[PDB]
Amino acid sequence: SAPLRILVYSDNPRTREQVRLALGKRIHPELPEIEYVDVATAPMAISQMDAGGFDLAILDGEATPAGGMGVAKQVKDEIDDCPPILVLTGRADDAWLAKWSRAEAAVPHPIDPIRLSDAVVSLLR
Amino acid sequence: PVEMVSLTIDDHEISVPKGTLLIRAAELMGIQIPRFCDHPLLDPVGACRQCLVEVEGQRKPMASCTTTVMPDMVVRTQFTSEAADKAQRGVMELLLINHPLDCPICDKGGECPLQNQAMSNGRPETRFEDVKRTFPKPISISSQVLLDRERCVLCARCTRFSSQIAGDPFIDLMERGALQQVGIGQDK
Amino acid sequence: FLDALAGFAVTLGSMFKKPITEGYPEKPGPVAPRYHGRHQLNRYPDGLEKCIGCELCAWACPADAIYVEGADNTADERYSPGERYGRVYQINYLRCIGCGLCIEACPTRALTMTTEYEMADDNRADLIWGKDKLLAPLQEGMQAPPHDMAPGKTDDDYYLGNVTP
Amino acid sequence: QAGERIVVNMGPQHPSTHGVLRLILEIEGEIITEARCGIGYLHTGIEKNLEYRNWTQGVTFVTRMDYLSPFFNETAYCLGVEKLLGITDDIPERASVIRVMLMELNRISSHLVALATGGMELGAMSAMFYGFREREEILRVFESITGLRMNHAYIRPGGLAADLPDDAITQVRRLVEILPKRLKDLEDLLNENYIWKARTVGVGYLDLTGCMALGITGPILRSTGLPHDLRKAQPYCGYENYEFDVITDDRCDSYGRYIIRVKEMHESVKIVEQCLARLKPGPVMISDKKLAWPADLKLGPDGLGNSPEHIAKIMGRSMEGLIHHFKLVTEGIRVPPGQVYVAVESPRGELGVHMVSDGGTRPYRVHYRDPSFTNLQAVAATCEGGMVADAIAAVASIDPVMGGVDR
Amino acid sequence: GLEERLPGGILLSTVETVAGYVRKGSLWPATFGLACCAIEMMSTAGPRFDIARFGMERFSATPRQADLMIVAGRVSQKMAPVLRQIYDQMVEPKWVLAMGVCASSGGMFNNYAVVQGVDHVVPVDIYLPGCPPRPEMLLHAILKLHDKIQQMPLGVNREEAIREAEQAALAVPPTIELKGLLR
Amino acid sequence: GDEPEIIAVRRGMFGNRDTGDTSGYGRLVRPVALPGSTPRPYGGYFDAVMDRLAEVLGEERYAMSIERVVVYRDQLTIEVSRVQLPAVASVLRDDPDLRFELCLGVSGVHYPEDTGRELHAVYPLMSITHNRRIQLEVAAPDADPHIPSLYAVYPTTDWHERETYDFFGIIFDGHPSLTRIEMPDDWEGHPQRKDYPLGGIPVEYHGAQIPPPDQRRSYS
Ligand SMILES: CC(C)=CCC/C(C)=C\CC/C(C)=C/CC/C(C)=C\CC/C(C)=C/CC/C(C)=C/CC/C(C)=C/CC/C(C)=C/CC/C(C)=C\CC1=C(C)C(=O)c2ccccc2C1=O
Ligand code: SF4
Ligand code: SF4
Ligand code: SF4
Ligand code: SF4
Ligand code: SF4
Ligand code: FES
């Protein structure tokens, strides 16, 4: 019943648009409604996740001032009971760091809408 | 059954189908003979004279792009004949004297057969202290194709294609001598 | 053996010598004349841009730190002699390694490397310096780039150096 | 037993481990019982990235491994490229002389960094500052000659990127005059210091047998008394024409290696004086226009850039000159297919380069046997059994440059 | 921190300015040099220059006492976890200076082994071009970071500044969309 | 084999891997062959070194072990047959007349077009006593990348066998522990293999980006 709240972190507004487009108000009709919180700066994302109340965080590994993998590592080291983290990786060879970030899932750029949706479903289920 | 003739290019023997051009045999053997007017899919014309090679029993250098293989021919390219190398380099020089100093702005730069073949088979510096031929550039021969006649080496590949391959001879070699230039009729 | 204490003499003596530090930033030290500082896009004496947009500088860059796009010097709007000019010219100084292959590559001396070096920013994008930042300042006698070539002159004259304000 | 043994990461982030070297030390109390090396924290894929850039662009890559010996990396690369081209005999005498002079000044600079960082790791705080003062004199010279303080790409296949500036010779003479005097300050701090000797003498012992087994070279090998130097054995760049003595010692310990480096700086000063004497006006690049780097850098009010004379030649007068400039700058020379191994005596030992060309404009395969990589195999021998403090001295004596290690 | 609990006004403004002045001075770097840029940091400390003139001579060996992490080198894949660990083990406030092109963006080494910019693993406050940056460039970047620190807010001002910076950053188009004059 | 070792076949003039920017130049076929066996009178001390190697090794063993001898640019490269590598290495190191005490390392190179011999390991050996230099070249197929580890003969090959395994996957069997040294143990793939992509990212620019050099055009 609660609208799942998803944090979308990316300096690039187009990556946020793509994430918010692959995912919709409902990932599937069986899932609850989805609410998106866009954040463009790592401090703001950290503050938001400090307030809690998030079911998933999508962090762009290509974020300019503070990459998504660093933010994922930070949040998993700083927020207790933090939501599962999905990281967007700018290249295949970033996969290793995606593992190091301990993000529950990694989706390479360019963001395949279906792959992102499937990963999000797997993390929420 | 296709008839195989055999001949020696430089000092390596090779067998190729009868009717093969020396340039094609050299290609199959791995010898890089410089060429501009030759085209595998166009009927040979022997215009640019760039593909000259020395053939035993012939006073003149022979354009490998027009020479059919013979069952006992002996061919030595610029790699194994000072005469052939000198001829090819002289042809390259004569090819470059009138050429514009346009490589930085030329679209073909970096992918230009003239640049590559001048590096591989040309002299390092010019002797042409005289005045270069010049044309207005670039003139349009159609809505899509621009023509910079100064860079033209008059290899006739454009015209030979538009005549043989496509039956659309709307471009042809106009004028005569140093003024010869590919062109459309007037405005057609 | 006092030799084992020689070090004490070195430090003590150097106490009474004037410190050798250069006084940057207030009194910056002298860089070498040949130092590989910021790239700079230069102009001809009449103000036309030298960059013909050949992309040789970008071609030779080992770090892909230069992005260049050429455009025609239409008679209505000419920026450089000849039929091409560099419409878009960007150097990603977060990829530039100061190797200097670009200036060695440039066939028009349009690209030089000045001795200026101060460069830093808190934003990655701000260090992608475009044509506006790299162009040399317009000096006395130079006109705005969008103007026709010098009277009675042509590209060859510019390259041979026969052009004046 | 296990209860009495700690295992501690000397770790990448540690003052003596150059930030990217991981010494994993098993210590009983404070004696290093066992040593391992995590390497590759500074790997860069330079060897693979070379494969996607033409020749004369790989110079900028190779100069950035063993960054304390930039000119040695560049010289090894260019010697290899020329050997594949078969033009090693065509390099102008001036170019070879300048290469030798720059490699020797670079040896002085690299030894200065080694002594500075070793002294700082061992508490000799002023050692770093004096060594870097001398190094800054040398780097002023390098900046004037090449326009860069570090990672120079000045040595190019077939010669040099550009000829020396008019004032470079006078600056190098001033170095040959003042540098031994300044090095006297650093030597006084350390050479005969009781604490320095106690801290280094008898530390990190490694016999000649160990050096051979692990393939050690450079100051470590020559601290065993073996006068092996690639400049004398297998001469290159015309080193055969210089009268210099191969510095060697018989202590086999850290102090012996330190003294070898100190004396090598003086030998390098002597070699640079010889180079200055031998230096004559002339070309610095092969005359073969098909291979010679076409650029002609010159200064002006605008800055450093292609000289106006070259600009005029290629854009106004010479079509062949323009084609050659365009091609040699853009895709560069194409090296005949082949496979060569070329070695130089970098400050840390035999810097070897295995280079393979497939006939193309890019190096098919470039591999650097960086002496630091092999020397680091001596850490287990030189640290095990000694205290952690002795381990610091031994590692500093190895003088690794992790850029050359990982590459 | 009680300094954050202080209410706005002249008190908080004076605390902010005093903290900024104090922190710009004594900005101890972490002893964390990588690759060839580390040699340039050492040169910056060398006599010809003097990092000490800015109160930054003490290169805190431990991350605990370090205020500024000058990455100063190329970060390999295997090293990114170590660099992040060092950054975390420093204590607030923390600043990162991406010295050199490799640290800032991967520089010339655009390949598998390099991380393509420190910011992929830790927040970067100043990007410093150069390969390596000559010591004057390092001092310039450090002074720019000093200016940034001096203006750093605190407490309620910190929260408001974070919100305003968010509002501003949400709107900036990406660099890929700055097609000015592209054909 | 006796012919020169063809490592790649390039089709078309101007060293273009793709179809060709200009029509009609793509028909040239030139195999890129690394030099074959040198005629017997090797120059310099190479002749003496091979004479001694053939004396210490039996004629049968010498034939079985030495696949080729290449004197290129006044440098001697013994294309040694796999499996026999430890024997010839021991002979070179221990024999008083050869005495190549100093093995300088092991360099991996990949020839994806060299059928059955894709992976090559190069052992630069130096004899300080005689002041001589040679290289050993050992070829292994990509399908069976195993090679005898010279750890017993040349301990220095450790960290060189490990590095070349990391960057090429050459399995130096008999090595005390052939673990990755440069890449993380968790890494996937062997970076310096030619098939392994460069793994770069596009370089950003206002309004554009330049793909990594491996994706863009080249004329090798
Ligand atoms: C408490 C309270 C409020 C009380 C009220 C009163 C009151 C306010 C104050 C009371 C007094 C108090 C408490 C005052 C506070 C200050 C205080 C207590 C002390 C702190 C200050 C202090 C101790 C100052 C002096 C310390 C000092 C002399 C420091 C200088 C140290 C030096 C010389 C450092 C330079 C070292 C250096 C060059 C570092 C570079 C190394 C780096 C980063 C690179 C890494 C690196 C290395 C190291 C290689 O070896 C290497 C080799 C080859 C290739 C690469 C590398 C490589 O990457
Ligand atoms: S066509 Fe002429 S101007 Fe254009 S690249 Fe070729 S040689 Fe240069
Ligand atoms: S325009 Fe026609 S004749 Fe001239 S070079 Fe091109 S194809 Fe040859
Ligand atoms: S700066 Fe020079 S090399 Fe670069 S596009 Fe302009 S003219 Fe060409
Ligand atoms: S200095 Fe070197 S890396 Fe930087 S833009 Fe110029 S050519 Fe490219
Ligand atoms: S930016 Fe240049 S000097 Fe600094 S670490 Fe990278 S390659 Fe080395
Ligand atoms: S290509 Fe044969 S004469 Fe022109």
PDB file of N, CA, C and O in Angstrom, chain E residues 91-140:
ATOM      1  N   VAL E  91      38.701  11.760   9.133  1.00  0.00           N
ATOM      2  CA  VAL E  91      37.567  12.187   9.937  1.00  0.00           C
ATOM      3  C   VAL E  91      37.147  13.587   9.518  1.00  0.00           C
ATOM      4  O   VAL E  91      37.959  14.382   9.036  1.00  0.00           O
ATOM      5  N   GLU E  92      35.866  13.889   9.716  1.00  0.00           N
ATOM      6  CA  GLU E  92      35.303  15.130   9.213  1.00  0.00           C
ATOM      7  C   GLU E  92      35.990  16.328   9.864  1.00  0.00           C
ATOM      8  O   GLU E  92      36.421  16.254  11.016  1.00  0.00           O
ATOM      9  N   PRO E  93      36.103  17.456   9.148  1.00  0.00           N
ATOM     10  CA  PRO E  93      35.776  17.615   7.730  1.00  0.00           C
ATOM     11  C   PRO E  93      36.865  17.044   6.835  1.00  0.00           C
ATOM     12  O   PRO E  93      38.029  17.042   7.222  1.00  0.00           O
ATOM     13  N   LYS E  94      36.490  16.572   5.653  1.00  0.00           N
ATOM     14  CA  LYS E  94      37.420  15.952   4.724  1.00  0.00           C
ATOM     15  C   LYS E  94      37.321  16.640   3.376  1.00  0.00           C
ATOM     16  O   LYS E  94      36.240  17.058   2.953  1.00  0.00           O
ATOM     17  N   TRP E  95      38.459  16.756   2.702  1.00  0.00           N
ATOM     18  CA  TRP E  95      38.495  17.289   1.351  1.00  0.00           C
ATOM     19  C   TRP E  95      39.442  16.450   0.514  1.00  0.00           C
ATOM     20  O   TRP E  95      40.447  15.938   1.012  1.00  0.00           O
ATOM     21  N   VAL E  96      39.114  16.319  -0.765  1.00  0.00           N
ATOM     22  CA  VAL E  96      39.894  15.531  -1.707  1.00  0.00           C
ATOM     23  C   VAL E  96      40.299  16.430  -2.861  1.00  0.00           C
ATOM     24  O   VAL E  96      39.448  17.087  -3.471  1.00  0.00           O
ATOM     25  N   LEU E  97      41.592  16.462  -3.152  1.00  0.00           N
ATOM     26  CA  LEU E  97      42.138  17.186  -4.290  1.00  0.00           C
ATOM     27  C   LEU E  97      42.618  16.168  -5.310  1.00  0.00           C
ATOM     28  O   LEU E  97      43.560  15.417  -5.044  1.00  0.00           O
ATOM     29  N   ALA E  98      41.969  16.133  -6.467  1.00  0.00           N
ATOM     30  CA  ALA E  98      42.334  15.196  -7.524  1.00  0.00           C
ATOM     31  C   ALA E  98      43.483  15.803  -8.314  1.00  0.00           C
ATOM     32  O   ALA E  98      43.289  16.437  -9.349  1.00  0.00           O
ATOM     33  N   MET E  99      44.700  15.608  -7.821  1.00  0.00           N
ATOM     34  CA  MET E  99      45.875  16.180  -8.461  1.00  0.00           C
ATOM     35  C   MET E  99      46.246  15.344  -9.677  1.00  0.00           C
ATOM     36  O   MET E  99      46.337  14.117  -9.591  1.00  0.00           O
ATOM     37  N   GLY E 100      46.462  16.008 -10.802  1.00  0.00           N
ATOM     38  CA  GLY E 100      46.838  15.335 -12.025  1.00  0.00           C
ATOM     39  C   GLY E 100      45.636  14.911 -12.845  1.00  0.00           C
ATOM     40  O   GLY E 100      44.516  14.790 -12.355  1.00  0.00           O
ATOM     41  N   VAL E 101      45.885  14.693 -14.135  1.00  0.00           N
ATOM     42  CA  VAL E 101      44.807  14.279 -15.021  1.00  0.00           C
ATOM     43  C   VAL E 101      44.353  12.868 -14.694  1.00  0.00           C
ATOM     44  O   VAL E 101      43.167  12.553 -14.810  1.00  0.00           O
ATOM     45  N   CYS E 102      45.273  11.988 -14.305  1.00  0.00           N
ATOM     46  CA  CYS E 102      44.869  10.625 -13.981  1.00  0.00           C
ATOM     47  C   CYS E 102      43.911  10.597 -12.801  1.00  0.00           C
ATOM     48  O   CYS E 102      42.861   9.951 -12.858  1.00  0.00           O
ATOM     49  N   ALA E 103      44.252  11.293 -11.722  1.00  0.00           N
ATOM     50  CA  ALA E 103      43.377  11.294 -10.557  1.00  0.00           C
ATOM     51  C   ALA E 103      42.031  11.915 -10.890  1.00  0.00           C
ATOM     52  O   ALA E 103      40.986  11.429 -10.446  1.00  0.00           O
ATOM     53  N   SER E 104      42.034  12.989 -11.672  1.00  0.00           N
ATOM     54  CA  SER E 104      40.800  13.706 -11.954  1.00  0.00           C
ATOM     55  C   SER E 104      39.891  12.957 -12.919  1.00  0.00           C
ATOM     56  O   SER E 104      38.688  12.855 -12.668  1.00  0.00           O
ATOM     57  N   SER E 105      40.430  12.435 -14.013  1.00  0.00           N
ATOM     58  CA  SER E 105      39.593  11.824 -15.037  1.00  0.00           C
ATOM     59  C   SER E 105      40.176  10.567 -15.658  1.00  0.00           C
ATOM     60  O   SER E 105      39.651  10.121 -16.680  1.00  0.00           O
ATOM     61  N   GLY E 106      41.229   9.983 -15.103  1.00  0.00           N
ATOM     62  CA  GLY E 106      41.915   8.891 -15.749  1.00  0.00           C
ATOM     63  C   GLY E 106      42.972   9.329 -16.733  1.00  0.00           C
ATOM     64  O   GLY E 106      43.800   8.507 -17.136  1.00  0.00           O
ATOM     65  N   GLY E 107      42.973  10.599 -17.122  1.00  0.00           N
ATOM     66  CA  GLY E 107      44.050  11.121 -17.937  1.00  0.00           C
ATOM     67  C   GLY E 107      44.236  10.334 -19.214  1.00  0.00           C
ATOM     68  O   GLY E 107      43.278   9.898 -19.858  1.00  0.00           O
ATOM     69  N   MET E 108      45.500  10.144 -19.580  1.00  0.00           N
ATOM     70  CA  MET E 108      45.833   9.465 -20.824  1.00  0.00           C
ATOM     71  C   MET E 108      45.505   7.982 -20.774  1.00  0.00           C
ATOM     72  O   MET E 108      45.440   7.331 -21.820  1.00  0.00           O
ATOM     73  N   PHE E 109      45.296   7.428 -19.583  1.00  0.00           N
ATOM     74  CA  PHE E 109      45.112   5.989 -19.428  1.00  0.00           C
ATOM     75  C   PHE E 109      43.625   5.641 -19.383  1.00  0.00           C
ATOM     76  O   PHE E 109      43.059   5.277 -18.355  1.00  0.00           O
ATOM     77  N   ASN E 110      42.995   5.774 -20.546  1.00  0.00           N
ATOM     78  CA  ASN E 110      41.585   5.439 -20.719  1.00  0.00           C
ATOM     79  C   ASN E 110      41.469   3.959 -21.080  1.00  0.00           C
ATOM     80  O   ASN E 110      41.312   3.571 -22.237  1.00  0.00           O
ATOM     81  N   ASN E 111      41.558   3.119 -20.052  1.00  0.00           N
ATOM     82  CA  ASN E 111      41.555   1.680 -20.257  1.00  0.00           C
ATOM     83  C   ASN E 111      41.000   0.986 -19.022  1.00  0.00           C
ATOM     84  O   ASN E 111      40.557   1.624 -18.066  1.00  0.00           O
ATOM     85  N   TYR E 112      41.045  -0.346 -19.058  1.00  0.00           N
ATOM     86  CA  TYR E 112      40.445  -1.157 -18.004  1.00  0.00           C
ATOM     87  C   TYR E 112      41.069  -0.882 -16.643  1.00  0.00           C
ATOM     88  O   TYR E 112      40.364  -0.803 -15.632  1.00  0.00           O
ATOM     89  N   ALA E 113      42.394  -0.744 -16.593  1.00  0.00           N
ATOM     90  CA  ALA E 113      43.104  -0.815 -15.323  1.00  0.00           C
ATOM     91  C   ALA E 113      42.899   0.414 -14.452  1.00  0.00           C
ATOM     92  O   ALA E 113      43.050   0.316 -13.232  1.00  0.00           O
ATOM     93  N   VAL E 114      42.575   1.561 -15.036  1.00  0.00           N
ATOM     94  CA  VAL E 114      42.484   2.813 -14.298  1.00  0.00           C
ATOM     95  C   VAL E 114      41.019   3.127 -14.050  1.00  0.00           C
ATOM     96  O   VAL E 114      40.150   2.749 -14.843  1.00  0.00           O
ATOM     97  N   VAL E 115      40.747   3.824 -12.944  1.00  0.00           N
ATOM     98  CA  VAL E 115      39.373   4.061 -12.502  1.00  0.00           C
ATOM     99  C   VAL E 115      38.677   5.164 -13.279  1.00  0.00           C
ATOM    100  O   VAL E 115      37.456   5.313 -13.157  1.00  0.00           O
ATOM    101  N   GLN E 116      39.404   5.928 -14.089  1.00  0.00           N
ATOM    102  CA  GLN E 116      38.812   7.016 -14.865  1.00  0.00           C
ATOM    103  C   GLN E 116      38.258   8.100 -13.950  1.00  0.00           C
ATOM    104  O   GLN E 116      37.099   8.499 -14.059  1.00  0.00           O
ATOM    105  N   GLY E 117      39.096   8.574 -13.038  1.00  0.00           N
ATOM    106  CA  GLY E 117      38.717   9.649 -12.148  1.00  0.00           C
ATOM    107  C   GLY E 117      38.526   9.184 -10.724  1.00  0.00           C
ATOM    108  O   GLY E 117      37.832   8.199 -10.468  1.00  0.00           O
ATOM    109  N   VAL E 118      39.143   9.896  -9.784  1.00  0.00           N
ATOM    110  CA  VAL E 118      38.982   9.566  -8.374  1.00  0.00           C
ATOM    111  C   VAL E 118      37.526   9.662  -7.970  1.00  0.00           C
ATOM    112  O   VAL E 118      37.033   8.846  -7.185  1.00  0.00           O
ATOM    113  N   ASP E 119      36.814  10.659  -8.492  1.00  0.00           N
ATOM    114  CA  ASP E 119      35.447  10.904  -8.058  1.00  0.00           C
ATOM    115  C   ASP E 119      34.563   9.676  -8.196  1.00  0.00           C
ATOM    116  O   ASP E 119      33.472   9.646  -7.623  1.00  0.00           O
ATOM    117  N   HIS E 120      35.003   8.661  -8.938  1.00  0.00           N
ATOM    118  CA  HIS E 120      34.239   7.426  -9.002  1.00  0.00           C
ATOM    119  C   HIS E 120      34.146   6.737  -7.650  1.00  0.00           C
ATOM    120  O   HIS E 120      33.258   5.901  -7.460  1.00  0.00           O
ATOM    121  N   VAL E 121      35.033   7.061  -6.712  1.00  0.00           N
ATOM    122  CA  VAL E 121      35.035   6.395  -5.412  1.00  0.00           C
ATOM    123  C   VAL E 121      34.998   7.354  -4.236  1.00  0.00           C
ATOM    124  O   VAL E 121      34.568   6.955  -3.141  1.00  0.00           O
ATOM    125  N   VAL E 122      35.429   8.605  -4.370  1.00  0.00           N
ATOM    126  CA  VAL E 122      35.362   9.556  -3.259  1.00  0.00           C
ATOM    127  C   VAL E 122      35.000  10.925  -3.794  1.00  0.00           C
ATOM    128  O   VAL E 122      35.389  11.306  -4.904  1.00  0.00           O
ATOM    129  N   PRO E 123      34.262  11.708  -3.006  1.00  0.00           N
ATOM    130  CA  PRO E 123      33.912  13.060  -3.455  1.00  0.00           C
ATOM    131  C   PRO E 123      35.164  13.889  -3.684  1.00  0.00           C
ATOM    132  O   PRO E 123      36.043  13.959  -2.824  1.00  0.00           O
ATOM    133  N   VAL E 124      35.236  14.527  -4.846  1.00  0.00           N
ATOM    134  CA  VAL E 124      36.373  15.354  -5.219  1.00  0.00           C
ATOM    135  C   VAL E 124      35.962  16.810  -5.100  1.00  0.00           C
ATOM    136  O   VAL E 124      34.913  17.212  -5.616  1.00  0.00           O
ATOM    137  N   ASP E 125      36.784  17.601  -4.417  1.00  0.00           N
ATOM    138  CA  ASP E 125      36.470  19.003  -4.186  1.00  0.00           C
ATOM    139  C   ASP E 125      37.113  19.916  -5.217  1.00  0.00           C
ATOM    140  O   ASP E 125      36.514  20.921  -5.607  1.00  0.00           O
ATOM    141  N   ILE E 126      38.323  19.596  -5.661  1.00  0.00           N
ATOM    142  CA  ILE E 126      39.014  20.376  -6.677  1.00  0.00           C
ATOM    143  C   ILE E 126      39.667  19.424  -7.664  1.00  0.00           C
ATOM    144  O   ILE E 126      40.283  18.429  -7.270  1.00  0.00           O
ATOM    145  N   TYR E 127      39.524  19.728  -8.948  1.00  0.00           N
ATOM    146  CA  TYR E 127      40.202  19.004 -10.013  1.00  0.00           C
ATOM    147  C   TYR E 127      41.399  19.820 -10.469  1.00  0.00           C
ATOM    148  O   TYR E 127      41.285  21.031 -10.678  1.00  0.00           O
ATOM    149  N   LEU E 128      42.543  19.162 -10.620  1.00  0.00           N
ATOM    150  CA  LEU E 128      43.780  19.847 -10.959  1.00  0.00           C
ATOM    151  C   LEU E 128      44.379  19.233 -12.216  1.00  0.00           C
ATOM    152  O   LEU E 128      44.892  18.104 -12.161  1.00  0.00           O
ATOM    153  N   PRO E 129      44.355  19.919 -13.355  1.00  0.00           N
ATOM    154  CA  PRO E 129      44.961  19.358 -14.567  1.00  0.00           C
ATOM    155  C   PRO E 129      46.463  19.201 -14.444  1.00  0.00           C
ATOM    156  O   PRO E 129      47.037  19.501 -13.396  1.00  0.00           O
ATOM    157  N   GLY E 130      47.107  18.735 -15.505  1.00  0.00           N
ATOM    158  CA  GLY E 130      48.540  18.540 -15.509  1.00  0.00           C
ATOM    159  C   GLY E 130      48.922  17.073 -15.444  1.00  0.00           C
ATOM    160  O   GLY E 130      48.189  16.227 -14.937  1.00  0.00           O
ATOM    161  N   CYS E 131      50.102  16.776 -15.969  1.00  0.00           N
ATOM    162  CA  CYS E 131      50.566  15.399 -16.041  1.00  0.00           C
ATOM    163  C   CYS E 131      52.084  15.337 -15.973  1.00  0.00           C
ATOM    164  O   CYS E 131      52.736  15.054 -16.985  1.00  0.00           O
ATOM    165  N   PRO E 132      52.689  15.596 -14.810  1.00  0.00           N
ATOM    166  CA  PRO E 132      52.016  16.014 -13.583  1.00  0.00           C
ATOM    167  C   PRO E 132      51.795  17.512 -13.543  1.00  0.00           C
ATOM    168  O   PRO E 132      52.401  18.232 -14.329  1.00  0.00           O
ATOM    169  N   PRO E 133      50.945  17.982 -12.637  1.00  0.00           N
ATOM    170  CA  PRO E 133      50.845  19.427 -12.415  1.00  0.00           C
ATOM    171  C   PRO E 133      52.111  19.931 -11.751  1.00  0.00           C
ATOM    172  O   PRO E 133      52.559  19.385 -10.743  1.00  0.00           O
ATOM    173  N   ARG E 134      52.696  20.977 -12.317  1.00  0.00           N
ATOM    174  CA  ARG E 134      53.885  21.526 -11.702  1.00  0.00           C
ATOM    175  C   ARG E 134      53.521  22.097 -10.335  1.00  0.00           C
ATOM    176  O   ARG E 134      52.368  22.462 -10.094  1.00  0.00           O
ATOM    177  N   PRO E 135      54.481  22.184  -9.417  1.00  0.00           N
ATOM    178  CA  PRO E 135      54.131  22.546  -8.038  1.00  0.00           C
ATOM    179  C   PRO E 135      53.368  23.850  -7.919  1.00  0.00           C
ATOM    180  O   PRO E 135      52.517  23.972  -7.033  1.00  0.00           O
ATOM    181  N   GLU E 136      53.635  24.831  -8.779  1.00  0.00           N
ATOM    182  CA  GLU E 136      52.836  26.049  -8.737  1.00  0.00           C
ATOM    183  C   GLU E 136      51.371  25.756  -9.021  1.00  0.00           C
ATOM    184  O   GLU E 136      50.490  26.356  -8.401  1.00  0.00           O
ATOM    185  N   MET E 137      51.085  24.846  -9.952  1.00  0.00           N
ATOM    186  CA  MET E 137      49.695  24.485 -10.206  1.00  0.00           C
ATOM    187  C   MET E 137      49.077  23.810  -8.990  1.00  0.00           C
ATOM    188  O   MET E 137      47.906  24.047  -8.670  1.00  0.00           O
ATOM    189  N   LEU E 138      49.844  22.963  -8.303  1.00  0.00           N
ATOM    190  CA  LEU E 138      49.335  22.345  -7.085  1.00  0.00           C
ATOM    191  C   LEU E 138      49.021  23.393  -6.031  1.00  0.00           C
ATOM    192  O   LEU E 138      47.986  23.319  -5.362  1.00  0.00           O
ATOM    193  N   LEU E 139      49.903  24.375  -5.863  1.00  0.00           N
ATOM    194  CA  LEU E 139      49.647  25.429  -4.891  1.00  0.00           C
ATOM    195  C   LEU E 139      48.436  26.257  -5.292  1.00  0.00           C
ATOM    196  O   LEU E 139      47.655  26.683  -4.437  1.00  0.00           O
ATOM    197  N   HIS E 140      48.265  26.500  -6.589  1.00  0.00           N
ATOM    198  CA  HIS E 140      47.084  27.215  -7.057  1.00  0.00           C
ATOM    199  C   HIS E 140      45.816  26.456  -6.701  1.00  0.00           C
ATOM    200  O   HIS E 140      44.848  27.036  -6.197  1.00  0.00           O
TER     201      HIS E 140
END
